[PDB]
Design a binder for this molecule. Structure first.
Ligand SMILES: N[C@@H](Cc1c[nH]c2ccccc12)C(=O)O
Ligand code: NA
Ligand code: NA
Lengths: 385, 385
């Protein structure tokens, strides 16, 4: 419920009941033998876990500083960390006796992850999507249909994510008995931020074994991009009780923090209650929540996860930002130098890691979370160049 | 050089020296401890090998016959089996003392795999693509550009694959001193058929181990799509001396075997010399090379590898055809039932495995080679729908 001062269940009473039933179910299963047999089985044979830790010999040498390892979540089925959470929640839903999954997306990336997992486990999938976002993302709409998901287009309101979240939360309230609401990131009302981190913490447990195998010591610094902060919490959480290990989140700097068009909640954001949780959001002079901007659609969220806010206060994790032009720089450089086309989201985490590598010694170690592959971001990089 | 009565080195005197150099270098490195350590290292940390063996429960249960396992080559870095051979030959070329890679691509897949391998190993990469293909494949061209390769667009002749192969031979004859020619299937003069199969046999080695751990016994049938036959030779070769393991290759049935618009060289082809090898090719009344057809670009090749001609003559493998229609259903059915979007190439193997499974016992095992993921084929299945 509470990561220090941040978190909670700040929702209407009609949602409070379901969330308690989810809370009760998650407790029963999260340590159950058969739930973890099934989950680990699918994560292995379907998703292709474990994912490798890659030493970037060329990139490390070009910089001349600390050794740069890349945790390759780009190689997971679907091409993003998002799959670990979708399988977990979709399986939990199946054992809870649910027959249907709902989710929300504008990009399409989380609906595809939700669709894939629904099809795996033989559940119905309805994905609420704004009619504006549908036109702009026709291939992810087609993917979802190919996967047997129903995309319900939302012509009510601004026809965007906001209205799709409203139409979706409306559905869950009614249908919770048989339907599960699969949340993308470590955001929203408890218990969602806890469950999503628990299903993404496989990244760090693997990274830990793999860096101790590769180098015979824990890493000096771990870098991860932060939209809502599922992948960062994934690769952070198991290294939390290792004081030596510095955790760095990279938010979207956008055009610049002084410019207004950014998504850096933990930098220039203010404490509020939105979308079920108490955390940092982006706000103007008045109390209103402002639009966010990032060239990476994944980092384009005004909010940040409550656990990341908690980690920023106690100074266990620093939180920095990277410009769109710096991210595109690192997108091109990793492609040329490692033959790995990263996600624009992961391009941010890369961009900083190269800066931090120069300043550190060749004996030292940087692990960078490569959250996904950039096949989905090829159009955006073309237009930008 | 010869697989029974098939294979050879049908090339000009100008290419005998380069190929002899390659064969001698290959003899030297193929069993070298360091080459194999370095190759296995790139395959693990960069490609994400091993790939899982996935039991398709819902598909298996829907047909009501044999267990259907998918070998998940779709999960390898780059999204196809082609990566295995691309790393292999690039690492061979580097340790030979070559500084440059040249390749022919039509569809662009082998171009991207060569470009990726190039970046990894820090070698120059010039890819020869028909200028007509460059217009059709904007993403793959941009991908190769990002990955630090030059696409050398070829404007001479038909502006197609044939003309790119010739100007890539012309290139090699001159530059072979510092250049390796990276062939992307088990075709062309010796020693290419041997080398490409050696670098793809990792697929079968992993699959033998995985099905023995999983089921405690060898598969009853192994099914792979056959264009040139590299992914097929790859999963077949380790099982050849296992007499009770049936091998089935699935060529492109196209619009139908009686239509004359297909790529089923082994079913409806004649023995003769083309592209430097004695194998089966599609021939007209004259005996000149007939154009081929498949909805899957990777199967759209009038010829087939000499080792597949050999396995057919000794009746060790059975070779069948699946139509564009049957593959399309396969593409849709797997996406909906297992949440895996296969390549149109691999959808041929899935299509035939589903037919075979219905006829067989629930206790019997089929391994299908899922050679790639269907992201690249989404435009063509949308047009078809
Ligand atoms: N996808 C590859 C397929 C390919 C390359 N070389 C081949 C030789 C034989 C058969 C198929 C191929 C391409 O770019 O076209
Ligand atoms: Na944010
Ligand atoms: Na063929």
């Amino acid at each position: 419920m509470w990561f220090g001062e941040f978190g909670g269940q700040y929702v209407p009473e009609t949602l409070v009941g379901p969330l308690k039933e989810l809370e009760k179910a998650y407790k029963r299963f999260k340590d159950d033998e058969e739930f973890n047999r099934q989950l680990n089985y699918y994560l292995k044979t379907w998703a292709g876990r474990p994912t490798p830790l890659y030493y970037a010999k060329r990139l490390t040498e070009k910089i001349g500083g600390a050794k740069v390892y890349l945790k390759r979540e780009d190689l997971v089925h679907g091409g993003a960390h998002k799959t670990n959470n979708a399988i977990g929640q979709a399986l939990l839903a199946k054992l809870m006796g649910k027959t249907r999954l709902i989710a929300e997306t504008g990009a399409g990336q989380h609906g595809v992850a939700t669709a894939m997992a629904g099809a795996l486990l033989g559940m119905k999938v309805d994905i609420y999507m704004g009619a504006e976002d549908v036109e702009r993302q026709k291939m992810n709409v087609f993917r979802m249909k190919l996967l047997g998901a129903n995309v319900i287009p939302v012509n009510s309101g601004s026809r965007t994510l906001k209205d799709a979240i409203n139409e979706a939360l409306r559905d869950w309230v009614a249908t919770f008995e048989y339907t599960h609401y699969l949340i993308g990131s470590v955001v929203g009302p408890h218990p969602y931020p806890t469950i999503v981190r628990d299903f993404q913490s496989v990244i760090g447990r693997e990274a830990k074994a793999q860096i101790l195998e590769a180098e015979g010591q824990l890493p000096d610094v771990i870098v991860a991009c932060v939209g809502g902060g599922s992948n960062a919490m994934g690769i952070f959480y198991p290294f939390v009780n290792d004081k030596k290990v510095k955790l760095v989140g990279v938010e979207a700097g956008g055009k610049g923090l002084e410019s207004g068009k950014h998504s850096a909640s933990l930098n220039a954001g203010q404490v509020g209650v939105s979308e079920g949780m108490l955390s940092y959001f982006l706000q103007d002079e008045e109390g209103q929540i402002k639009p966010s901007h990032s060239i990476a659609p994944g980092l384009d969220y005004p909010g940040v996860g409550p656990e990341h806010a908690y980690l920023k206060k106690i100074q266990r994790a620093e939180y920095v930002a990277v410009t769109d032009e710096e991210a595109l720089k690192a997108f091109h450089e990793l492609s040329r130098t490692e033959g790995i086309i990263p996600a624009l989201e992961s391009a941010h985490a890369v961009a900083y890691a190269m800066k931090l590598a120069k300043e550190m010694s060749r004996d030292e170690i940087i692990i960078v979370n490569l959250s996904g592959r950039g096949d989905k971001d090829l159009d955006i990089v073309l237009k930008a160049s």
